[PDB]
Amino acid sequence: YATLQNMVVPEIAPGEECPSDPVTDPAHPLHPANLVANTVKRMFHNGRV
Amino acid sequence: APQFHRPSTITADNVRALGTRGLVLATNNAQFIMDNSYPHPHGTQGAVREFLRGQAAALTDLGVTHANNTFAPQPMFAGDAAAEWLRPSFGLKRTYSPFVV
Amino acid sequence: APQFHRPSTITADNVRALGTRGLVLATNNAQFIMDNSYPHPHGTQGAVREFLRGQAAALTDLGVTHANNTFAPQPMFAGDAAAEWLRPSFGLKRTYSPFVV
């Protein structure tokens, strides 16, 4: 449980759509700007889902 | 200032004073005929250790020019975290593209 | 401000007042040396009990900042409706996209 409530959630821009691609859009939480060590959305990217 | 066509000019400071891009050109534009009048005093294979230490340090130069382009090196494996008595340590499988817009 | 290298420092209010994003880097910048001069009064197993109650209370604070992003949560299952003698209690298969433009 200590690494399920442990993630990087960027705030959405006012008037922008939802981020769908982790590769291009930096507001996506699985983007390589957000893939920190010891976290689970990077573990969403280590094990790619 | 190193000169490649002689054995006893290359030192550690002579390799790292030129970067990665310039070392592509000057080694592809050097002299064919090797001089042998005064060789390297630690032998002609001793300078082989002397040059190539400056190459893996030359991408630490390119790591700095792309420190505004790549990411900080996260620990690739577990066991590396300040707190291990309440939280575990992951390690990032660095399949991602080090790429900052 | 809690110190993660001391078990007798972390309370529920120290974790909740710190943000969820600020809770990430504060746990990664702690000390590798674990101090045993002042343990937690409920034991070392009790310090694990105190720390994680502040994280789940911070998920409720995260739902407040994202209340303009999702909607009001509908009742999921049977048996819960105001007027049950003329219409039943509905429940959503929550597979939609909770998103406010």
Side-chain angles (χ1 to χ4, degrees), chain A residues 1-15 18-20 22-40 43-49, chain B, chain C:
Chain A
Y1 283 113
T3 59
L4 287 172
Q5 50 190 355
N6 192 0
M7 64 187 73
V8 179
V9 179
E11 183 67 28
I12 195 65
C18 182
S20 64
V23 179
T24 298
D25 197 2
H28 193 276
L30 274 69
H31 186 73
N34 291 320
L35 305 180
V36 193
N38 299 323
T39 188
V40 72
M43 194 59 70
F44 276 114
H45 187 273
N46 294 319
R48 291 180 59 88
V49 174
Chain B
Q3 287 180 353
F4 295 104
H5 65 279
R6 293 175 186 175
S8 65
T9 307
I10 296 170
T11 62
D13 288 330
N14 289 321
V15 186
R16 197 177 183 182
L18 184 60
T20 59
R21 179 68 176 88
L23 191 61
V24 176
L25 294 174
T27 61
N28 286 318
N29 295 322
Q31 190 180 6
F32 291 100
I33 292 95
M34 181 178 176
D35 293 332
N36 290 316
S37 66
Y38 289 99
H40 195 271
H42 286 280
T44 58
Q45 293 293 322
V48 182
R49 298 173 186 172
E50 188 73 23
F51 183 80
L52 296 166
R53 291 185 178 94
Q55 289 189 359
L59 296 172
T60 64
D61 290 332
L62 193 63
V64 172
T65 63
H66 290 277
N68 293 319
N69 197 5
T70 60
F71 298 107
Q74 299 90 17
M76 310 174 195
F77 299 96
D80 182 74
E84 286 185 352
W85 63 274
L86 57 90
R87 65 180 179 89
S89 66
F90 292 157
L92 301 192
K93 303 180 179 183
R94 300 185 189 177
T95 67
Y96 59 92
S97 63
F99 184 74
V100 176
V101 176
Chain C
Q3 293 181 356
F4 298 100
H5 63 278
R6 292 179 182 177
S8 65
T9 305
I10 299 169
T11 60
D13 290 330
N14 290 318
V15 180
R16 185 178 178 180
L18 184 61
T20 59
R21 181 64 178 86
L23 189 64
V24 177
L25 294 175
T27 58
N28 291 320
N29 290 316
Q31 186 177 3
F32 293 97
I33 294 96
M34 183 177 177
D35 291 330
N36 290 318
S37 66
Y38 293 100
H40 192 273
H42 296 284
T44 61
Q45 298 293 321
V48 185
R49 295 176 184 176
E50 186 69 28
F51 172 75
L52 293 174
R53 290 187 179 93
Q55 292 185 355
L59 291 176
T60 61
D61 290 331
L62 186 63
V64 177
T65 61
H66 294 285
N68 288 318
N69 199 3
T70 61
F71 299 101
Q74 290 84 16
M76 295 180 185
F77 299 103
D80 188 75
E84 292 181 354
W85 60 274
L86 56 90
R87 66 177 178 87
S89 61
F90 287 167
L92 293 178
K93 293 191 176 186
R94 292 185 182 182
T95 63
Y96 61 93
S97 65
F99 185 76
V100 177
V101 174

PDB file of all heavy atoms in Angstrom, chain B residues 80-83 85-87, chain C residues 4 27-28 30-32 51:
ATOM      1  N   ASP B  80      18.392   0.667  -3.321  1.00  0.00           N
ATOM      2  CA  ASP B  80      18.927   2.025  -3.293  1.00  0.00           C
ATOM      3  C   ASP B  80      17.785   2.981  -2.975  1.00  0.00           C
ATOM      4  O   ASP B  80      17.150   3.537  -3.875  1.00  0.00           O
ATOM      5  CB  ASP B  80      19.595   2.375  -4.617  1.00  0.00           C
ATOM      6  CG  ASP B  80      20.213   3.755  -4.608  1.00  0.00           C
ATOM      7  OD1 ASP B  80      21.267   3.933  -3.966  1.00  0.00           O
ATOM      8  OD2 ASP B  80      19.635   4.663  -5.235  1.00  0.00           O
ATOM      9  N   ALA B  81      17.535   3.168  -1.684  1.00  0.00           N
ATOM     10  CA  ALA B  81      16.561   4.132  -1.200  1.00  0.00           C
ATOM     11  C   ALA B  81      16.969   4.530   0.208  1.00  0.00           C
ATOM     12  O   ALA B  81      17.553   3.723   0.936  1.00  0.00           O
ATOM     13  CB  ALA B  81      15.140   3.565  -1.210  1.00  0.00           C
ATOM     14  N   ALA B  82      16.664   5.774   0.579  1.00  0.00           N
ATOM     15  CA  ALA B  82      17.077   6.281   1.884  1.00  0.00           C
ATOM     16  C   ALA B  82      16.296   5.613   3.010  1.00  0.00           C
ATOM     17  O   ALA B  82      16.825   5.403   4.106  1.00  0.00           O
ATOM     18  CB  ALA B  82      16.908   7.798   1.932  1.00  0.00           C
ATOM     19  N   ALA B  83      15.036   5.273   2.755  1.00  0.00           N
ATOM     20  CA  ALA B  83      14.174   4.633   3.747  1.00  0.00           C
ATOM     21  C   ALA B  83      13.830   3.231   3.255  1.00  0.00           C
ATOM     22  O   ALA B  83      13.135   3.056   2.256  1.00  0.00           O
ATOM     23  CB  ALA B  83      12.924   5.468   3.996  1.00  0.00           C
ATOM     24  N   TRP B  85      12.902   0.881   5.922  1.00  0.00           N
ATOM     25  CA  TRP B  85      12.176   0.268   7.029  1.00  0.00           C
ATOM     26  C   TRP B  85      10.680   0.551   6.998  1.00  0.00           C
ATOM     27  O   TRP B  85       9.940  -0.021   7.805  1.00  0.00           O
ATOM     28  CB  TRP B  85      12.770   0.711   8.371  1.00  0.00           C
ATOM     29  CG  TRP B  85      12.672   2.179   8.663  1.00  0.00           C
ATOM     30  CD1 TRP B  85      13.549   3.151   8.281  1.00  0.00           C
ATOM     31  CD2 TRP B  85      11.660   2.835   9.439  1.00  0.00           C
ATOM     32  NE1 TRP B  85      13.137   4.373   8.752  1.00  0.00           N
ATOM     33  CE2 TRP B  85      11.981   4.208   9.466  1.00  0.00           C
ATOM     34  CE3 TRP B  85      10.510   2.397  10.104  1.00  0.00           C
ATOM     35  CZ2 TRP B  85      11.194   5.144  10.135  1.00  0.00           C
ATOM     36  CZ3 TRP B  85       9.730   3.330  10.766  1.00  0.00           C
ATOM     37  CH2 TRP B  85      10.075   4.688  10.775  1.00  0.00           C
ATOM     38  N   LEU B  86      10.214   1.415   6.098  1.00  0.00           N
ATOM     39  CA  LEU B  86       8.787   1.643   5.900  1.00  0.00           C
ATOM     40  C   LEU B  86       8.353   1.518   4.449  1.00  0.00           C
ATOM     41  O   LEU B  86       7.196   1.175   4.189  1.00  0.00           O
ATOM     42  CB  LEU B  86       8.389   3.025   6.460  1.00  0.00           C
ATOM     43  CG  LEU B  86       9.045   4.326   5.979  1.00  0.00           C
ATOM     44  CD1 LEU B  86       8.325   4.973   4.799  1.00  0.00           C
ATOM     45  CD2 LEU B  86       9.154   5.305   7.136  1.00  0.00           C
ATOM     46  N   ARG B  87       9.240   1.798   3.500  1.00  0.00           N
ATOM     47  CA  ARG B  87       8.929   1.717   2.081  1.00  0.00           C
ATOM     48  C   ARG B  87      10.017   0.927   1.351  1.00  0.00           C
ATOM     49  O   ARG B  87      11.164   0.892   1.804  1.00  0.00           O
ATOM     50  CB  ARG B  87       8.792   3.126   1.478  1.00  0.00           C
ATOM     51  CG  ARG B  87      10.066   3.931   1.473  1.00  0.00           C
ATOM     52  CD  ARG B  87       9.876   5.302   0.865  1.00  0.00           C
ATOM     53  NE  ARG B  87      11.128   6.045   0.901  1.00  0.00           N
ATOM     54  CZ  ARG B  87      12.042   6.002  -0.058  1.00  0.00           C
ATOM     55  NH1 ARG B  87      11.838   5.265  -1.140  1.00  0.00           N
ATOM     56  NH2 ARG B  87      13.161   6.700   0.058  1.00  0.00           N
TER      57      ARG B  87
ATOM     58  N   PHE C   4      12.170  11.200   8.546  1.00  0.00           N
ATOM     59  CA  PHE C   4      11.902   9.798   8.261  1.00  0.00           C
ATOM     60  C   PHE C   4      12.984   8.860   8.781  1.00  0.00           C
ATOM     61  O   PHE C   4      12.838   7.641   8.643  1.00  0.00           O
ATOM     62  CB  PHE C   4      11.719   9.609   6.753  1.00  0.00           C
ATOM     63  CG  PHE C   4      10.557  10.375   6.192  1.00  0.00           C
ATOM     64  CD1 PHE C   4      10.761  11.586   5.548  1.00  0.00           C
ATOM     65  CD2 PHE C   4       9.262   9.897   6.316  1.00  0.00           C
ATOM     66  CE1 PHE C   4       9.696  12.306   5.031  1.00  0.00           C
ATOM     67  CE2 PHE C   4       8.188  10.610   5.805  1.00  0.00           C
ATOM     68  CZ  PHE C   4       8.411  11.815   5.163  1.00  0.00           C
ATOM     69  N   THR C  27      10.522  11.486   1.253  1.00  0.00           N
ATOM     70  CA  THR C  27      10.912  10.136   1.651  1.00  0.00           C
ATOM     71  C   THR C  27      12.152   9.662   0.902  1.00  0.00           C
ATOM     72  O   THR C  27      12.838   8.742   1.363  1.00  0.00           O
ATOM     73  CB  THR C  27       9.753   9.162   1.432  1.00  0.00           C
ATOM     74  OG1 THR C  27       9.361   9.180   0.053  1.00  0.00           O
ATOM     75  CG2 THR C  27       8.563   9.528   2.307  1.00  0.00           C
ATOM     76  N   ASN C  28      12.450  10.263  -0.249  1.00  0.00           N
ATOM     77  CA  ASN C  28      13.620   9.873  -1.027  1.00  0.00           C
ATOM     78  C   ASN C  28      14.881  10.629  -0.631  1.00  0.00           C
ATOM     79  O   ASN C  28      15.971  10.258  -1.083  1.00  0.00           O
ATOM     80  CB  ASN C  28      13.352  10.066  -2.522  1.00  0.00           C
ATOM     81  CG  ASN C  28      12.335   9.077  -3.063  1.00  0.00           C
ATOM     82  OD1 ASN C  28      12.341   7.901  -2.698  1.00  0.00           O
ATOM     83  ND2 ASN C  28      11.460   9.549  -3.943  1.00  0.00           N
ATOM     84  N   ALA C  30      15.894  11.120   2.665  1.00  0.00           N
ATOM     85  CA  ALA C  30      16.094  10.846   4.079  1.00  0.00           C
ATOM     86  C   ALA C  30      17.531  10.389   4.332  1.00  0.00           C
ATOM     87  O   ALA C  30      18.410  10.509   3.475  1.00  0.00           O
ATOM     88  CB  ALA C  30      15.074   9.819   4.567  1.00  0.00           C
ATOM     89  N   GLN C  31      17.785   9.859   5.526  1.00  0.00           N
ATOM     90  CA  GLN C  31      19.109   9.416   5.938  1.00  0.00           C
ATOM     91  C   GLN C  31      19.181   7.895   5.910  1.00  0.00           C
ATOM     92  O   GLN C  31      18.231   7.210   6.303  1.00  0.00           O
ATOM     93  CB  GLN C  31      19.439   9.938   7.343  1.00  0.00           C
ATOM     94  CG  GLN C  31      20.858   9.660   7.816  1.00  0.00           C
ATOM     95  CD  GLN C  31      21.145  10.257   9.180  1.00  0.00           C
ATOM     96  OE1 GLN C  31      20.268  10.848   9.809  1.00  0.00           O
ATOM     97  NE2 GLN C  31      22.381  10.103   9.643  1.00  0.00           N
ATOM     98  N   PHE C  32      20.318   7.370   5.436  1.00  0.00           N
ATOM     99  CA  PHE C  32      20.500   5.923   5.357  1.00  0.00           C
ATOM    100  C   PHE C  32      20.724   5.312   6.735  1.00  0.00           C
ATOM    101  O   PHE C  32      20.458   4.121   6.942  1.00  0.00           O
ATOM    102  CB  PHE C  32      21.668   5.594   4.428  1.00  0.00           C
ATOM    103  CG  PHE C  32      21.416   5.942   2.988  1.00  0.00           C
ATOM    104  CD1 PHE C  32      21.877   7.140   2.460  1.00  0.00           C
ATOM    105  CD2 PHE C  32      20.712   5.075   2.165  1.00  0.00           C
ATOM    106  CE1 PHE C  32      21.643   7.465   1.134  1.00  0.00           C
ATOM    107  CE2 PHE C  32      20.477   5.394   0.836  1.00  0.00           C
ATOM    108  CZ  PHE C  32      20.943   6.593   0.323  1.00  0.00           C
ATOM    109  N   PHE C  51       2.240   6.178  10.339  1.00  0.00           N
ATOM    110  CA  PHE C  51       2.665   6.850   9.112  1.00  0.00           C
ATOM    111  C   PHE C  51       1.650   6.709   7.981  1.00  0.00           C
ATOM    112  O   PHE C  51       1.322   7.698   7.318  1.00  0.00           O
ATOM    113  CB  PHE C  51       4.030   6.295   8.694  1.00  0.00           C
ATOM    114  CG  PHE C  51       4.501   6.757   7.345  1.00  0.00           C
ATOM    115  CD1 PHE C  51       4.976   8.044   7.155  1.00  0.00           C
ATOM    116  CD2 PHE C  51       4.498   5.883   6.272  1.00  0.00           C
ATOM    117  CE1 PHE C  51       5.419   8.459   5.909  1.00  0.00           C
ATOM    118  CE2 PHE C  51       4.935   6.280   5.028  1.00  0.00           C
ATOM    119  CZ  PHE C  51       5.399   7.571   4.848  1.00  0.00           C
TER     120      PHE C  51
END
